[PDB]
Write a protein that binds this DNA or RNA. Sequence first.
RNA 1: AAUUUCUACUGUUGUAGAUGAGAAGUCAU
DNA 2: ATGACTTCTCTAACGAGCTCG
DNA 3: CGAGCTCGTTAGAGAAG
Length: 1274
Amino acid sequence: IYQEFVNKYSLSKTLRFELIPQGKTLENIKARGLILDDEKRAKDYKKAKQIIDKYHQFFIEEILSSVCISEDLLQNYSDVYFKLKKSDDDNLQKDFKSAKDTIKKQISEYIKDSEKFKNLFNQNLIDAKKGQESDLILWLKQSKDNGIELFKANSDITDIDEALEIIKSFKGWTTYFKGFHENRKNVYSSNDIPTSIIYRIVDDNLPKFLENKAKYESLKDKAPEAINYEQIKKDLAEELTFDIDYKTSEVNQRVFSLDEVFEIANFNNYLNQSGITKFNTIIGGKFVNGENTKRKGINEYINLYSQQINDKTLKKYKMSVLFKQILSDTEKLEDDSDVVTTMQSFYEQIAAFKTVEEKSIKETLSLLFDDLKAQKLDLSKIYFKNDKSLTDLSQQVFDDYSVIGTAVLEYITQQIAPKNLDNPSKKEQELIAKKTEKAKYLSLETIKLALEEFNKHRDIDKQCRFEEILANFAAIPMIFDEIAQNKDNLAQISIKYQNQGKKDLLQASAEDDVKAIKDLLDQTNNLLHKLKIFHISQSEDKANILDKDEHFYLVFEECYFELANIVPLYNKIRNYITQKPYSDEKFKLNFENSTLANGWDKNKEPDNTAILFIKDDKYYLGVMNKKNNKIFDDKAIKENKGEGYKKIVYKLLPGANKMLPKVFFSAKSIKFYNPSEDILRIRNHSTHTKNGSPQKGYEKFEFNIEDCRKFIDFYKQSISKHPEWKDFGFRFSDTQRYNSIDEFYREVENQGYKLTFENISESYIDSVVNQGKLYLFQIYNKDFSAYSKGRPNLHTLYWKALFDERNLQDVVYKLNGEAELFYRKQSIPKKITHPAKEAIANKNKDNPKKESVFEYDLIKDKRFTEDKFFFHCPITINFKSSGANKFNDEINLLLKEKANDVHILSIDRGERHLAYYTLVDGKGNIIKQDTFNIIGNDRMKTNYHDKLAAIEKDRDSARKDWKKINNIKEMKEGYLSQVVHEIAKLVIEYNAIVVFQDLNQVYQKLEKMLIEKLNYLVFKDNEFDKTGGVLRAYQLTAPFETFKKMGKQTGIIYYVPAGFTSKICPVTGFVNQLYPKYESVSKSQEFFSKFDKICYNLDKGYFEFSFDYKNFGDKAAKGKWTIASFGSRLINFRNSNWDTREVYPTKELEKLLKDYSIEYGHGECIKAAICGESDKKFFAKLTSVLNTILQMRNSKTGTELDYLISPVADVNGNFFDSRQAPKNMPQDADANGAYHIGLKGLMLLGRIKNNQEGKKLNLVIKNEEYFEFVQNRN
RNA sequence: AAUUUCUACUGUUGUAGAUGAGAAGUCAU
DNA sequence: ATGACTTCTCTAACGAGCTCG
DNA sequence: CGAGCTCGTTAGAGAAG
């Protein structure tokens, strides 16, 4: 049970709303320029960061290159890594810490004491102080306007002279940058973070630079290669000027060599980005636009050394690639003109695209398509590939299914011809061990050798040979004339889409015009489908030449090589019409205020300028204007103490590490608080802390419990003297029972939150709104109306419990600050598409109602058709008792008293069902069992595989007229969200824990949506502030960190290994790990000799193969089987007509062993009759029998009929077909695919109810443990 | 086809569920 | 071209700096 | 020039598979 598992840790939601402009606020908002003069700010703030991160680049350009030389200590780090990468010892894993925290401090002390660093993260960046010049404009004007570096030209901003007009226009706005001057302290950081530029060099360039020099001098062994220092260094000459030197001393102008490279003392050259562009250039190889190919590189000599030997081990000493530096850069057609201008420019390349013979596409290619029609030329210069592309010939001209496509394989796979069988069933789970290269190729002479034998199989001599199709291009020049005739009809849609910044072609008004270009995309659409019939892919078997000539394939690449832009264009404007209309920017409203609502707090209300209100459960926002911002001071509230709205007194104490030593020990009020001798002594040297900083100008001494618990005693003598903070009613614990400073601030910030209500009369608000000294908005969604028949959302079941009375008894929902306001521009013209009162037809066919009346109108989507405000407002749930470390471990200690009580869930994947839960109790007897297609079971009961069953057939829409709007691209993710609720209502109600598939696409995004969707879980129609309510409710899972470190247990969703659950009988537990494969005739006979007795059931009427696995070596498991030949089993085949051909077990044997000299009706061992039999035709159709004597899952044309059968009997002597099963066994081919996860997981409650005193107990399953366990619940 | 936004709906100027937001950062099925 | 995954804050009050007093 | 004075810093605790 989970009834004691409430109130565990702190979250950070973001309740979002829409703001309704009430009174006449939006008259005033458009009266002054606060939206027109917005989004030239808030779309240049987001364009300011190409005038600051074009300065963080140029800063790192001169803090790591010329300077910051961590010289010769790299040899100290070289020694602590090569010896460490074999051995994990305390002699060196803590000396791994040595040059870890030495090189960074050798760097970061040069970072934090540098030239431009100090005046970078304050006001001195943009505009500093009166008379002085700030660093950025000093950089931009006095270094970059004078020294003209034309690098603003490579962006959307025109020049530097306009760029300065942005920078001056942020004067006064430099606390609107507390989200962007947060992500630059963590670029020059020095910490355990994966973000910095110092983590980049010290932890992910240097430890992958030691691997580069260790495998460079090993490459100097067996090195005869013509590396460019042996022949020519003019190639990498200007690229390797190298006016510095970090080996001995800097030389003016000499060019380095390969001796300088990979030196441990020359890594100081290879630190920043300007130099990873020279490390990974000598390794990489530069391009030259002087009619040159790619010049020679180091790993282009490991290919030039392989001209002498073809070693697989030759490539293992190549050069890797170091990463790119943080924030440096090298130096989705959503434009409506580019849909027409691309093909309009692409249409112009036909007359300008010429061949190699000095003629045009028509001036030379016209007569070339009418000369070799007799096939007199060498038509054997072709090379195909027999993987997927071979079916286009017979599927294009023969119109067959499994006849012409199966006549190339047997002649090609029998090259070396080591083989006897096929059809590999497992296949689980590995790719390769060392290497494997064999054995086949692709060409056209095998088509002459495999189809030419069938060319003479007809009666008459006018059949289909391999050479009777050479005249397919008799009008190759005239075929382009059809696309040219469809070019004159483009000026209308080009006139209809003449606007650039509109995106006004994929609207509903251009619905009929979409056939003007989608049907216009048919003249070049199908030709590209046939355009791949003149060039094979790179399916070469290590000798990809194929005898390429230049006679027949001379002018093909000169004209047809330019035809790939239709694949670029038609493959580029697919999602342009597919995409739904959103077309916004969703930009932050400021209301002319760098701090719009950082915090809703009373002493700083005239600078956040944002107030909330309450009137009869309709929640309000109030944004004051800045010029009138003291209009709710203490004066104008004592006057207007009337009745009307309510008003919010949100009083806050944030950062008790940052606050209580801010007021008590600073220059304004230290004398009134009067610190003593002993108490200021402690805070001088940080004596009350374990890692706390001292006052700067001291040194960190020891922690003392005596010099900490007396320092907590100071704080009970200065908060009470603070003029306001005495009113919180702090009630601390006794200072004998405070352990340190961490267990004291858990009783400051868990009480520094007071929320009271002081009434404001309505008539006072209406005056200042109409005058303009407020902006009153309304907090609104579906759940705030009188048209609320039933259940609310969660983002309104929360907001109605921020301001609640029962919230403020003891706070479990703390309003946070930091919030913003957003304004979305409109993108949809309102066209109604459902007029008044008429009959409207449904779309759910599971409905006891077929029509709809609807007096009013219903527009397509009323969201985007209205210019709406938006308000995002964070909270912090379980604010007073946060923490919950070791939360995987804490829920496991919950279970130990709770044995014999908690039932177990289970969830598959699939596409036959989509999931299949099964509530397994402690003893395998399942309680519930239901699918997840019919879900949403209130009374509507919609169905979900059936909706996919046409969107499984989605690959038809965008092909003809380029019109695909059918929602695969979001429905995938969205089905799972309904499931999340429905998993969860079972979890709590059945005292249930959850298992899953471990996964050691939307194939893990369900499991994503049960971690962060059981952070905190709340049932809407549960009793308020009762055991699972909205205040006190269920937190069961620790949050999501990664999918990788998700681990075996991320809460109560355990995991079991994915393999061997879907082929198992429930009552006994067989798996066919034995793989009958038929290598050869006698090479199967030793398998049949290993059986116990292949007798017959004269008493029953079916064969049986008694067997034990241990006489074969794999090894699977241990037990006397006696498998049988009972149930009717189905076999699929090549569908296209042939998808089901049912084969009986016993009838197929009695046809076959009776056909040979084997008599069997007596009923004893028939070993030596089979073992003595030695026919080619016998065993090939006998191992295939036992292949399908054990194929326990059977479809019919799966789906719609996919039941369960099972060979093996039991102690009852009974088999198991699913149609004669009771309820407490599985039912389908995914229900047995889920029930074993539902008892592989049951021993994860077998371990945890019996966990050691040693509290480590891993949750990994070895396969033999399960394979024994399931067989032995009996 | 109505939404704080997304999917699915008629569940009737909405019902049932879902929900963490901004701005950066590297990098890969 | 989407999914990965590492990081910030989720903020009141003091105090340098300011326009004048 | 002490009031004022509006906007930017600045006070800096703590578990670790």
